Design a protein around this ligand. Structure first.
Ligand code: NA
Ligand code: NA
Length: 327
DNA sequence: CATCTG
DNA sequence: CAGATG
């Protein structure tokens, strides 16, 4: 956690690079388990061979670990941290919609910057385009104070559309967090579930409402069960308009809400531990359900949940307010 | 995993 | 349809 800090870090750099610039998914994937194991490793890595000793650690990584230990540096790391080409890919990638794949193409067409992009807005697709248009806004954290107003709107709108809506704002927003990245809304309706064959409208009626009033600004992706878009808190008495923020809305069959809602709420840590305990208590839990564990190895069948409460109960645990869902 | 693009 | 992004 701090004993083999740098090592795990350098490695993550390397790994990252492999995958991002080169297309080295193996290599990439290599640094990963690597940092993972030295990461757990209880001692102070005093040398390569010592590390080597570990699984995932080969000769090549060992090599690298030496020079790093030997000198507060790594050539290759240094060589990569300069190199324009590499730098560009790490940068383009910042745009919503640009991935590494795309980052590569662009640079190889000489688009390596923000301007480059605008100049070539023709080569970008809708998502990507927006992504560019909102570069700044998109990187700006979302202060809970805005979050609450947003939440205030979404809910009221969903409500007017149909009393049976059940919306929820998961995320850290939910866990207490002073600021969040994007807004994530979980959605369901009674008339929607596991068997119940569809109801796309269910999702589209609200999307529309939100656009009605202007909360929703652009559409990134709109499917029948998942919507990816952009929203905005009406700028008051003109002088201060708000940044644009990412917002997602997903439909969920009523019979699977709480697990989703639990799940989405996090933290990743909370989950696991909660997930591990579930297992002890003879249970299984994932994104959508809680299933009693057979002894023959494994086994299913969906337990029935009417709240986040139903779940814990099952695993026979202390109900946890979202706030302490930390770890 | 669900949506898009081409 | 494979392949990309989130
Ligand atoms: Na990106
Ligand atoms: Na292939």
């Amino acid at each position: 956690e701090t004993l083999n800090g740098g090592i795990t870090d350098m490695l993550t750099e390397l790994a990252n690079f492999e995958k991002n610039v080169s297309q080295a998914i193996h290599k990439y994937n290599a640094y990963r388990k690597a940092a993972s194991v030295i990461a757990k490793y209880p001692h102070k890595i005093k040398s390569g061979a010592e590390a080597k000793k570990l699984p995932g650690v080969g000769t090549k990584i060992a090599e690298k670990i030496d020079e790093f230990l030997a000198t507060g540096k790594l050539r290759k790391l240094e060589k990569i941290r300069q190199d324009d080409t590499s730098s560009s890919i790490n940068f383009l990638t910042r745009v919503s919609g640009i991935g590494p794949s795309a980052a590569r193409k662009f640079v190889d067409e000489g688009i390596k910057t923000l301007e480059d992009l605008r100049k070539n807005e023709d080569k970008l697709n809708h998502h990507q385009r927006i992504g560019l248009k909102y570069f700044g806004d998109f990187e700006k954290r979302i202060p809970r104070e805005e979050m609450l107003q947003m939440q205030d709107i979404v809910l009221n709108e969903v409500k007017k559309v149909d009393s049976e809506y059940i919306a929820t704002v998961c995320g850290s927003f939910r866990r207490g967090a002073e600021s969040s990245g994007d807004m994530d809304v979980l959605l369901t309706h009674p008339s929607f579930t596991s068997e119940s064959t569809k109801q796309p409208k269910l999702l589209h009626q609200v999307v529309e409402q939100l656009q009605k009033v202007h909360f929703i600004t652009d559409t990134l992706s709109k499917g029948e069960t998942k919507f990816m878009g952009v929203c905005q808190l009406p700028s008051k008495n003109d002088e201060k308009e708000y940044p644009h923020r990412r917002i997602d809305i997903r439909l969920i069959p009523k019979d699977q809400y709480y697990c989703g809602v639990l799940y989405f709420t996090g933290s990743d840590i909370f989950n696991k531990n909660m997930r591990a305990h579930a297992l002890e208590k003879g249970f299984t839990i994932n994104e959508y359900t809680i299933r009693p564990l057979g002894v023959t190895g494994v086994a299913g069948e969906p337990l029935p949940v009417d709240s986040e409460k139903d779940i814990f109960d099952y695993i026979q645990w202390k109900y946890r307010e979202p706030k302490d869902r930390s770890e």
